[PDB]
Write an enzyme that holds these catalytic residues in place. Structure first.
Site, PDB file in Angstrom:
ATOM      1  N   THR A  44      29.821 -59.871 -14.885  1.00  0.00           N
ATOM      2  CA  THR A  44      31.088 -60.552 -14.919  1.00  0.00           C
ATOM      3  C   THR A  44      30.911 -62.069 -15.250  1.00  0.00           C
ATOM      4  OG1 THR A  44      32.126 -59.075 -13.311  1.00  0.00           O
ATOM      5  CG2 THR A  44      33.015 -61.253 -13.517  1.00  0.00           C
ATOM      6  N   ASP A  96      36.011 -62.031 -18.513  1.00  0.00           N
ATOM      7  CA  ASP A  96      35.627 -60.925 -19.379  1.00  0.00           C
ATOM      8  C   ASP A  96      36.240 -59.628 -18.779  1.00  0.00           C
ATOM      9  OD1 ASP A  96      33.657 -60.611 -17.192  1.00  0.00           O
ATOM     10  OD2 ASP A  96      32.718 -59.115 -18.511  1.00  0.00           O
ATOM     11  N   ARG A 108      34.348 -56.289 -18.691  1.00  0.00           N
ATOM     12  CA  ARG A 108      33.355 -55.277 -18.352  1.00  0.00           C
ATOM     13  C   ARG A 108      33.193 -55.066 -16.880  1.00  0.00           C
ATOM     14  NH1 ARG A 108      27.413 -55.323 -21.285  1.00  0.00           N
ATOM     15  NH2 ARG A 108      28.855 -54.900 -23.001  1.00  0.00           N
ATOM     16  N   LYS A 124      40.299 -58.689 -14.427  1.00  0.00           N
ATOM     17  CA  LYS A 124      39.683 -59.491 -13.385  1.00  0.00           C
ATOM     18  C   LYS A 124      40.504 -60.713 -12.952  1.00  0.00           C
ATOM     19  CE  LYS A 124      35.306 -57.992 -15.207  1.00  0.00           C
ATOM     20  NZ  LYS A 124      33.920 -58.400 -15.567  1.00  0.00           N
ATOM     21  N   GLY A 164      31.989 -59.798  -8.346  1.00  0.00           N
ATOM     22  CA  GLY A 164      31.140 -59.334  -7.258  1.00  0.00           C
ATOM     23  C   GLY A 164      31.495 -57.878  -7.094  1.00  0.00           C
ATOM     24  N   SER A 219      27.697 -62.957 -12.894  1.00  0.00           N
ATOM     25  CA  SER A 219      26.362 -62.921 -13.508  1.00  0.00           C
ATOM     26  C   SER A 219      26.266 -63.808 -14.786  1.00  0.00           C
ATOM     27  CB  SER A 219      25.923 -61.468 -13.773  1.00  0.00           C
ATOM     28  OG  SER A 219      26.889 -60.788 -14.584  1.00  0.00           O
ATOM     29  N   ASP A 259      24.920 -62.474 -21.211  1.00  0.00           N
ATOM     30  CA  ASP A 259      24.712 -61.796 -19.977  1.00  0.00           C
ATOM     31  C   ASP A 259      24.988 -60.280 -20.202  1.00  0.00           C
ATOM     32  OD1 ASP A 259      24.738 -60.985 -17.131  1.00  0.00           O
ATOM     33  OD2 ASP A 259      26.890 -61.378 -17.081  1.00  0.00           O
ATOM     34  N   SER A 298      28.158 -58.755 -18.660  1.00  0.00           N
ATOM     35  CA  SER A 298      29.457 -59.151 -19.170  1.00  0.00           C
ATOM     36  C   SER A 298      29.712 -58.597 -20.507  1.00  0.00           C
ATOM     37  CB  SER A 298      29.621 -60.715 -19.227  1.00  0.00           C
ATOM     38  OG  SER A 298      29.467 -61.311 -17.935  1.00  0.00           O
TER      39      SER A 298
END
Ligand SMILES: [Cl-]
Ligand SMILES: [Cl-]
Ligand SMILES: [Cl-]
Ligand SMILES: [Cl-]
Ligand SMILES: [Cl-]
Ligand SMILES: [Cl-]
Ligand SMILES: [Cl-]
Ligand SMILES: [Cl-]
Ligand SMILES: [Cl-]
Ligand SMILES: [Cl-]
Ligand SMILES: [Cl-]
Ligand SMILES: [Cl-]
Ligand SMILES: [Cl-]
Ligand SMILES: [Cl-]
Ligand SMILES: [Cl-]
Ligand SMILES: [Cl-]
Ligand SMILES: [Cl-]
Ligand SMILES: [Cl-]
Ligand SMILES: [Cl-]
Ligand SMILES: [Cl-]
Ligand SMILES: [Cl-]
Ligand SMILES: [K+]
Ligand SMILES: [K+]
Ligand SMILES: [Mg+2]
Ligand SMILES: [Mg+2]
Ligand SMILES: [Mg+2]
Lengths: 230, 202, 204, 239, 244, 220, 234, 248
Positions: F1, F17, F19, F33, F47, F129, F166, F169
């Protein structure tokens, strides 16, 4: 500790007189009216507003429960605030679980159940209020009354408080099924004028409406506008 | 973190760096570690940010309520005592090293340390946090009884700057506050305003 | 891994005005097959099903406790539960056990009881919901399942094509997984009927 | 009847059970407090109901914190219980806040406790009124009085019990703001002797305590020799 | 009906046959036992509370006789009625405000604090085992959007915001006086707010005060912190009034 | 994320994002999100997904009860306190890492909230992340008092940095723009990632799958 | 009347009839006497016997090595209170390794026994005690009442016709401080004997004695053990 | 507090429980409600009290409640009390189903509720529920069943009965017309209308004034239906045609 015995009991003749007596507090309350139009619901109430000294805007009798549900009452104001708070909390509890706004009828059932508790549970008296609850869901308007026993009823139109018997016969001879919301607001305000006393202003009545877009109080200025005709 | 406070005749000076780290990532480079507990009582926070924020909020509540009831400004000693009670009682579940400093009409400028474990001791000046290790010698050699407010401010800014140079877990800007009967005066030293001491090249 | 103690696989898939849900049929304990007709997909309405993979005991408990709640809901409310609402009910049931969860990760498949619009979703074991417009998968061969679904699924499939796609996705996925299979059951849900089939499948 | 429970108002808005508890205080013999320049002095007319009792039995003067005295009238078991409440409150305050409880706050806290016994059928009001006295350099001399309803006020001079009014009228004659504790003790004794009805109740002990600059802010019994001199002055003044 | 009674309806908070709560009615009578009247008035710039200060006994430390109370830095109150009840209610108000700030991170609005105390009082009207508090609370503070506020709550659990209001023995007469005065005023709003309050009190009691016989508390838009006037300050208002 | 936020001249821009992963597999390509708190307040979550959803929903519900009561628009500090006090109580076991932004009577406010209950009030923040990739963008390019469109550019750039650098993400960039006057919930804002197209067809005709048993149950 | 059934109901005279009624339970008990010298504290009790073949009710109870009691009123309340006292004494030796000072124990009795006088549905304790003890402040006789009040006494008598015993004790109390033990117990017996109908006498079947002092742990004398004390009432 | 406790759960001198009796008086004044068992099914028919012109009509009935798949009930007495009890019935029936994975047998559900009612007459100091109920159902042990309970926690099974206004009269007419072992749903329906026609003597019977539910079995499944107003008027019509035959 708390008294653990019921304060409402059966009389010999089968009556729960504390609940009757609660209904007498409702009947002596300020008048309230609800009319279910084809496309919405109107709730209207008289303010028992003495004095010019009152800040009319500081407390409201017509109150939002959710975006789509609102209430009014006749009887004891402080008892009503209890039920408004519980209704709000009930609605949110429902929303957390189901992720959908509480259907009006479900909200009425759960509030009515609280009122029933106060007729039996230990060391308490019943609520001295009757509620009129409006909502919109499943593409359709709802008008309900919940009484001090915890009984509830769905109405097309009704009146409660002082002079309600007359108010009800005034609405019988005036409500039609295919009536619009704006006309309904007019007839609701006329129903209050039947028992008013004092000359009506936008400050001593309070009006709430409910439709597809949601529940809201009418503003002083909107009420003023409906009052010109009356 | 590095935190510091110093008593002078009529008040106190408090300071902190502004670095908050998770591991060796800097999650906030401009942290405010000097938190007001009442009109003239601050705490400097080190240790777990969650812990010191929760504890400081709670004490602020307790002290405010106490103060209204008494209808008087609160004692610095009282603020410290409230921190101590909570830090001691919950010493197994908290990582908090606190300096309480401020002014009251009864005792003037006062500095208290509440280090981890929840003891409480009054001091002329106090340091704490991870960076404090690197400035014990400096403060021991530089401290003089009877410094003015301005001297306390310089002594603080210097000590903090030295700590910040050496401690990976301290850095950013230096936040200072002076507290006296007249009130609280806050400022930030940044960039070229931070005292500078050469790297010792050949 | 707790989630593989029993093995198993479920998936659901959206088509035009229809949905499909499928499951393997093995009930086993680590290597040992115990039975080959174990139910993992349960009716929650005429046009609404829930499939559960994971630990068999929790598959059964969740299905049962969910039914308890749903039956009370439907008696109290006027009406048949909406798919999205079922999802929420299930989320709330799973998240009550946030710190000692049921080891199951359900999929839901159905049609809205009034509009007949297709719905599919899945949830993790603590109740995080995920709605999609294509498919969802849960079980010990989720990678295999994803690979089959990503490659075969297309939009707006008719019931017959949906049945072939979900069937080929399941059979081929479970045949790469030691602890899933021993049969496949498929329910196709349409406005006017449910079609239930068991597939010819490997039994090793 | 409207006078059986502290949770029932009469039609005129009275709480008769609290009024009845006040009558118990009003039947009691008299206690007085006087605040002066450098402290607070307490005196009690302590009726001796049997000669078989020890000197000091049934004290009506208590230490509730090292800096705080309490003087009581009314039902003595209720008063002692309140002295324990006061003690516990002073102790808890020191543990929580780390300094000696200010008199006013202690008065307000115990008064709320007394007050809590005036709302309910479950319990009855305390049959006692009590004074709290302290002295410190920072706060000066302070004297508070708390009654069965839970009202709390501060005083220059105060009297409770059956000769309350006669006591107050004698207290009003003193310029206490300008007098010291050592001068005031004599006047306390004098006033107890004046208001004592030697015909109707035959035997009493004078009880005296003080807190002031002269005790360094500690509440203490007046020393024996000073009490005896004050009695002798009161007795001769009666003449 | 017309004053009827059954069973225990004058002893506990159950309904009488007209739907009244006699015990609640009696709590209103308890407010007058004290013999005192309070007045509160709001203008565009400030809100003021004035009450009688009666110190019959010379031996009282008159600095400890007050009915004015700080609830928070920005909220003041005047209490009328039974004193110990009043003090209890003041403590509860202080607790509610402090708790609100801790949980929500901003100061409790005066209207919300008044509502909260009124809701707590409501419970005493519905549960049989305790009495109502025989007191009435008037709150003042500045709201950032609505300006100066005056709110009152009572032993029935009713509450309301006001242009001006009163409590205690001469409440009705105060209400009459204040009504007559606002009608006169353009946009129905008080402008000389401390003078109106003192004048109202003086008229309905027929007293013409000394500065030691009233207490005055204020909040202003420029100075929202609740402040208690000194004797000299109050004297300046008394003298300014006496001279026209 | 990757989640982030910025304070700009007239408001807040939040970003995220889309994912969600289970292990190192993508479970959802399009999860949301940026969660509703109140009409004037939103919160990005990173998280443990069920924890972020449930936490934000609960606080949003308590805030609605609060605002119904007060009759006023809620404050960002109030959401911050309610979130942080609950997260503190749970000692980090509720794995919600949040970016909370809104506009109240005191103007725009932005906070980052950590699982253990610490909060930081800052003019830009990142979490998840992907948070270092996004933070690098902000450190390099943020200016105080940006205009709306600049702020939206910067936030989407920062989310894009997390998306591409990342493994946790991916997929789309959602934004939420909050000012005194406007709420723009832009889902999706950008779709920088797309499935390649399918070159062969596997339209398997009726009868391809052999069937052992069949039952048709007709419905009303 | 409407005021006499609940310990929570003050009468309009500022009295609590339930507490007064509880005190009548002590006035109807058999009489007991307590007195002290410089060195000893003595209890003397009359035991009432139900029938001519009953033993005679215990009046005197051990509390700790340094404390004993004599009782008058409801025997079950006496045991409940005695068990409380015992436990308070044990607690103090466990914690501090020293005897519980007598005046502190009596304070604890006052606080414990006050509590039910103020709560609905509770009742006072229907017992009065004479408490004999010896500690660092010397010998003590205390008296405890159903009102929860207590008294520090030079000597005392409670129970039926105890007025007589009290009169005797006032008459001779200036002698008590200097009395040897035999003298002091003799005084206790003579006082107790004033409570009796003129026919009747102190006997080994009706008298119980308890003594504690500097040299002597709390000891109870009954039946044949009271004879030394009864002979030479000369 | 002993002074205010009206002592709802004590015996009177003749061994009676006054509250229970008084609650039974409340019921006797409520809407008439009858139940009739047949060979192919069971029915409930009830007087509506919700009859004012301005009422809205929003639920599928006023006083008929579905309890689970195989059972329904009706009630006479305090409505709010009936809502508590019917909610509790549904809970009990789901508890069973959860535990055993089969529907609760009819008599077992009734008895479980009746034990709650009984408790309220014996301890806790509360007023009893002012409700009598008629329960209709099918189970695999005794097939079609009809039960009646009252506020004492007493219950019984019946082939036909009545609670509420004019119960005694309604039971007399049932005693006389009911054919044990030979009733059909169609003839039970006719009889229900005959009975309500006599016992609503304030005044002339109408579909708007009654509610009828049937419980039947179709293809191994229980079907519970509330008759529409078209069907109710038709039955009223048929009964009025029938009384025209009554002389010649
Ligand atoms: Cl009870
Ligand atoms: Cl609310
Ligand atoms: Cl909602
Ligand atoms: Cl609104
Ligand atoms: Cl921090
Ligand atoms: Cl430390
Ligand atoms: Cl430290
Ligand atoms: Cl640190
Ligand atoms: Cl930094
Ligand atoms: Cl469950
Ligand atoms: Cl007095
Ligand atoms: Cl706070
Ligand atoms: Cl004006
Ligand atoms: Cl905060
Ligand atoms: Cl993350
Ligand atoms: Cl005895
Ligand atoms: Cl006995
Ligand atoms: Cl006594
Ligand atoms: Cl006696
Ligand atoms: Cl069912
Ligand atoms: Cl079932
Ligand atoms: K550094
Ligand atoms: K009450
Ligand atoms: Mg396989
Ligand atoms: Mg194999
Ligand atoms: Mg921790």
């Amino acid at each position: 500790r708390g008294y653990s015995f019921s304060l409402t009991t059966f009389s010999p003749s089968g009556k729960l007189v504390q609940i009757e007596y609660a209904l007498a507090a409702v009947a002596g309350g300020a008048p309230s009216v609800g009319i279910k139009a084809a496309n919405g619901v109107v709730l209207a109430t008289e303010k028992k507003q003495k004095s010019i000294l009152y800040d009319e805007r500081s407390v409201h009798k017509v109150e939002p429960i959710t975006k789509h549900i609102g209430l009014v009452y006749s009887g004891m104001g402080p008892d009503y605030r209890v039920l408004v708070h519980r209704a709000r909390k009930l609605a949110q509890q429902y929303y957390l679980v189901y992720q959908e706004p509480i259907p009006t009828a479900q909200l009425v059932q759960r509030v009515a159940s609280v009122m029933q508790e106060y007729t039996q549970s230990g060391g308490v008296r019943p609520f001295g209020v009757s509620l009129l609850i409006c909502g919109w869901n499943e593409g359709r308007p709802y008008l309900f009354q919940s009484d001090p026993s915890g009984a509830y009823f769905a109405w097309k139109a009704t009146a409660m408080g002082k002079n309600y018997v007359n108010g009800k016969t005034f609405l019988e001879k005036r409500y039609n099924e295919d009536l619009e919301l704006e006309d309904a607001i007019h007839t609701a305000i006329l129903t209050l004028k039947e028992s008013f006393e004092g000359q009506m202003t936008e400050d001593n009545i309070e009006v709430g409406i409910c439709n597809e877009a949601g529940f809201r109080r009418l503003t002083p200025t909107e009420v003023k506008d409906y009052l010109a005709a009356i | 973190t590095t935190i510091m406070a110093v008593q002078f005749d009529g008040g106190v000076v408090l300071g902190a760096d502004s670095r908050t780290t998770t591991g060796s990532y800097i999650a906030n480079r401009v942290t405010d570690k000097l938190t007001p507990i009442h009109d003239r009582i601050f705490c400097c926070r080190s240790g777990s940010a969650a812990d010191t924020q929760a504890v400081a909020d709670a004490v602020t509540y307790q002290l405010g309520f106490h103060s209204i009831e008494l209808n008087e400004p609160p004692l610095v000693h009282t603020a410290a005592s409230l921190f101590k009670e909570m830090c001691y009682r919950y010493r197994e579940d908290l990582m908090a090293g606190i300096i309480i400093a401020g002014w009251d009409p009864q005792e003037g400028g006062q500095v208290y340390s509440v280090p981890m474990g929840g003891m409480m001791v009054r001091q002329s000046f106090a340091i704490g946090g991870s960076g404090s290790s690197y400035i014990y010698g400096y403060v021991d050699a530089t401290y003089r009884e009877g410094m003015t407010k301005e001297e306390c401010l310089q002594f603080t800014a210097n000590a903090l700057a030295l700590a910040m140079e050496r401690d990976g877990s301290s850095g950013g800007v230096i936040r200072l506050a002076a507290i006296a009967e007249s009130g609280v005066e806050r400022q930030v030293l940044l960039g070229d305003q931070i005292p500078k001491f050469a790297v010792a090249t050949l | 891994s707790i989630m593989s103690y029993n093995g198993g696989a479920v998936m659901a898939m959206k088509g035009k005005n229809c949905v499909a849900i499928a499951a393997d049929r093995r009930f086993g304990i680590q290597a040992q097959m115990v039975t080959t007709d174990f139910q993992k997909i349960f009716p929650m309405g005429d046009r609404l099903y829930i499939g559960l993979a994971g630990l068999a005991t929790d598959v059964q408990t969740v299905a049962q406790r969910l039914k308890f709640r749903l039956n009370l809901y439907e008696l109290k409310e006027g009406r048949q539960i909406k798919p999205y609402t079922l999802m929420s009910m299930v989320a709330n049931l799973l998240y009550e056990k946030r710190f000692g969860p049921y080891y199951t990760e359900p999929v839901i498949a159905g049609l809205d009881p009034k509009t007949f619009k297709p719905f599919i979703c899945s949830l993790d074991l603590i109740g995080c919901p995920m709605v999609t417009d294509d498919f969802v998968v849960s079980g010990t061969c989720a990678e295999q399942m994803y690979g089959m679904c990503e490659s075969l699924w297309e939009p707006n499939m008719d019931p017959d094509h949906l049945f072939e796609t979900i069937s080929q996705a399941m059979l081929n996925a479970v045949d790469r997984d030691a602890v899933s299979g021993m049969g496949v059951i498929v329910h196709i849900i349409e406005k006017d009927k449910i079609t239930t089939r068991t597939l010819k499948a490997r039994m090793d | 009847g409207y006078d059986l429970s502290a949770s029932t108002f009469s039609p005129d808005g009275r709480v008769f059970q609290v009024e009845y508890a006040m009558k118990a205080v009003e039947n009691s013999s008299t206690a007085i407090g006087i605040r002066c320049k450098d402290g607070v002095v307490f005196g009690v007319e302590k009726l001796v109901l049997s000669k078989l009792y020890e000197e000091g039995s049934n004290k009506r003067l208590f230490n509730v914190d090292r800096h705080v005295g309490m003087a009581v009238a009314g039902l003595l078991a209720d008063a002692r219980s309140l002295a324990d409440i006061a003690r516990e409150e002073a102790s808890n305050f020191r543990s929580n806040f780390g300094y000696n409880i200010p008199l006013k706050h202690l008065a307000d806290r115990v008064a709320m406790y007394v007050h809590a016994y005036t709302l309910y059928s479950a319990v009855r009001p305390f049959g006692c009124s009590f004074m709290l006295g302290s002295y410190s350099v920072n706060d000066g001399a302070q004297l508070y009085m708390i009654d069965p309803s839970g009202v709390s006020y501060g005083y220059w001079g105060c009297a409770i019990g059956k000769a309350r009014q006669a006591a107050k009228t004698e207290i009003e004659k003193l310029q206490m703001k300008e007098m010291t504790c050592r001068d005031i003790v004599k006047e306390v004794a004098k006033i107890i002797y004046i208001v004592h009805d030697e015909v109707k109740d035959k035997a009493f002990e004078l009880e005296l305590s003080w807190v002031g600059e002269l005790t360094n802010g500690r509440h203490e019994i007046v020393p024996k020799d000073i009490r005896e001199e004050a009695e002798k002055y009161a007795k001769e003044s009666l003449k | 009906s017309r004053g009827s009674s059954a069973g225990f309806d004058r002893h506990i908070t159950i309904f009488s046959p007209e739907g009244r709560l006699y015990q609640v009615e009696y709590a209103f009578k308890a407010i007058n036992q004290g013999g005192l009247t309070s007045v509160a008035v709001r203008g565009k710039d400030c809100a003021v509370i004035v009450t009688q200060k009666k110190v019959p006994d010379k031996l009282l430390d008159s600095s400890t006789v007050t009915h004015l109370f700080k609830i928070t830095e920005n909220i003041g109150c005047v209490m009328t009625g039974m004193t110990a009840d009043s003090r209890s209610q003041v403590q509860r108000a202080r607790y509610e405000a402090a708790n609100w700030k801790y949980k929500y991170g901003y100061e409790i609005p005066v209207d919300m604090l008044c509502k909260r105390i009124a809701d707590i009082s409501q419970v005493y009207t519905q549960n049989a085992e305790m009495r109502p508090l025989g007191c009435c609370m008037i709150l003042i503070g500045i709201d950032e959007e609505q300006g100066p506020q005056v709110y009152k709550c009572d032993p029935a659990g009713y509450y309301c915001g006001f242009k001006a209001t009163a409590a205690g023995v001469k409440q009705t007469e105060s209400t009459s006086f204040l009504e007559k005065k606002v009608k006169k005023k353009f946009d129905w709003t008080f402008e000389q707010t401390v003078e109106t309050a003192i004048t109202c009190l003086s008229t309905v009691l027929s007293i013409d005060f000394k500065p030691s016989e009233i207490e005055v508390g204020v909040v202003t838009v420029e100075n929202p912190k609740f402040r208690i006037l000194t004797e000299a300050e109050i004297d300046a208002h008394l003298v300014a009034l006496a001279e026209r | 994320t990757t989640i982030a936020g910025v304070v700009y001249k007239d408001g807040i821009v939040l970003g995220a994002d889309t994912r969600a992963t289970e292990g190192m597999v993508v479970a959802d390509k399009n999860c949301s999100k940026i969660h509703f708190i109140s009409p004037n307040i939103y919160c990005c979550g990173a998280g443990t997904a069920a924890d972020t959803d449930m936490t934000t929903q609960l606080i949003s519900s308590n805030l609605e009860l609060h605002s119904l009561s007060t009759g006023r628009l809620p404050r960002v500090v109030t959401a911050n306190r309610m979130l942080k006090q609950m997260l503190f109580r749970y000692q980090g076991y509720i794995g919600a890492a949040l970016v909370l932004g809104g506009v109240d009577v005191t103007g725009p406010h932005l906070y980052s909230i950590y699982p253990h209950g610490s909060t930081d009030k800052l003019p830009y923040v990142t979490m998840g992340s992907g948070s270092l990739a996004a933070m690098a963008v902000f450190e390099d390019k943020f200016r105080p008092d940006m205009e709306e469109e600049e702020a939206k550019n910067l936030v989407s750039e920062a989310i894009a940095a997390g998306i591409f650098n990342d493994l946790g993400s991916g997929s789309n960039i959602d934004l939420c723009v909050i000012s005194k006057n406007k709420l723009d919930f832009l889902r999706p804002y950008t779709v920088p990632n797309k499935k390649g197209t399918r070159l062969g067809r596997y339209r398997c005709e009726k009868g391809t799958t052999a069937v052992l048993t069949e039952k048709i149950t007709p419905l009303e | 009347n409407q005021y006499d059934n609940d310990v929570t109901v003050w009468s309009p005279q500022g009295r609590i009839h339930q507490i007064e009624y509880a005190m009548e339970a002590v006035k109807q008990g058999s009489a007991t006497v307590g007195l002290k010298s410089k060195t000893h504290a003595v209890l003397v009790a009359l035991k009432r016997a139900q029938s001519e073949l009953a033993a005679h009710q215990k009046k005197i109870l051990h509390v700790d090595n340094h404390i004993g009691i004599s009782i008058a009123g409801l025997t079950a309340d006496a045991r409940l209170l005695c068990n409380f006292m015992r436990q308070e004494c044990l607690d103090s030796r466990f914690v501090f390794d020293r005897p519980l000072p007598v005046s502190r124990l009596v304070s604890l009795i006052g606080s414990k026994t006050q509590i039910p006088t103020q709560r609905y549905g509770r009742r006072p304790y229907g017992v009065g005690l004479l408490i004999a003890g010896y500690d660092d402040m010397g010998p003590h006789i205390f008296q405890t009442c159903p009102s929860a009040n207590y008294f520090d006494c030079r000597a005392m008598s409670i129970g039926a016709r105890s007025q007589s015993a009290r009169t005797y004790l006032e008459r001779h109390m200036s002698e008590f401080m200097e009395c040897n033990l035999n003298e002091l117990v003799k005084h206790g017996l003579r006082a107790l004997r004033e409570t009796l109908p003129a026919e009747q006498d102190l006997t080994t079947k009706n008298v119980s004695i308890g003594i504690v002092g500097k040299d002597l742990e709390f000891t109870i004398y009954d039946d044949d053990d009271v004879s030394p004390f009864l002979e030479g009432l000369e | 507090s002993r002074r205010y406790d009206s002592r709802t759960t004590i015996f009177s001198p003749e061994g009676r429980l006054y509250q229970v009796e008084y609650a039974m008086e409340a019921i006797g004044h409520a809407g008439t409600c009858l139940g009739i068992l047949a060979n192919d099914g069971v029915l409930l028919a009830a007087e509506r009290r919700n009859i004012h012109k301005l009422l809205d009509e929003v639920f599928f009935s006023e006083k008929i409640y579905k309890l689970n798949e195989d059972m329904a009930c009706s009630v006479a007495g305090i409505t709010s009390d009936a809502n508590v009890l019917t909610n509790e019935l549904r809970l009990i029936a789901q508890r069973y189903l959860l535990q055993y994975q089969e529907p609760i047998p009819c008599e077992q559900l009734v008895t479980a509720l009746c034990d709650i009612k009984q408790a309220y007459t014996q301890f806790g100091g509360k007023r009893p529920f002012g409700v009598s109920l008629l329960y209709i159902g099918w189970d695999k042990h005794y097939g079609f069943q009809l039960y009646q309970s009252d506020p004492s926690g007493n219950y019984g099974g019946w082939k036909a009965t009545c609670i509420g206004n004019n119960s005694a009269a309604a039971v007399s007419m049932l005693k006389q017309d009911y054919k044990e072992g030979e009733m059909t749903l169609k003839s039970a329906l006719a009889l229900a209308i005959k009975v309500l026609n006599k016992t609503m003597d304030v005044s002339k019977l109408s579909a708007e004034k009654v509610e009828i539910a049937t419980l039947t079995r179709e293809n191994g499944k229980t079907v519970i239906r509330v008759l529409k107003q078209k069907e109710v008027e038709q039955l009223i019509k048929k009964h009025e045609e029938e009384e025209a035959k009554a002389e010649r």
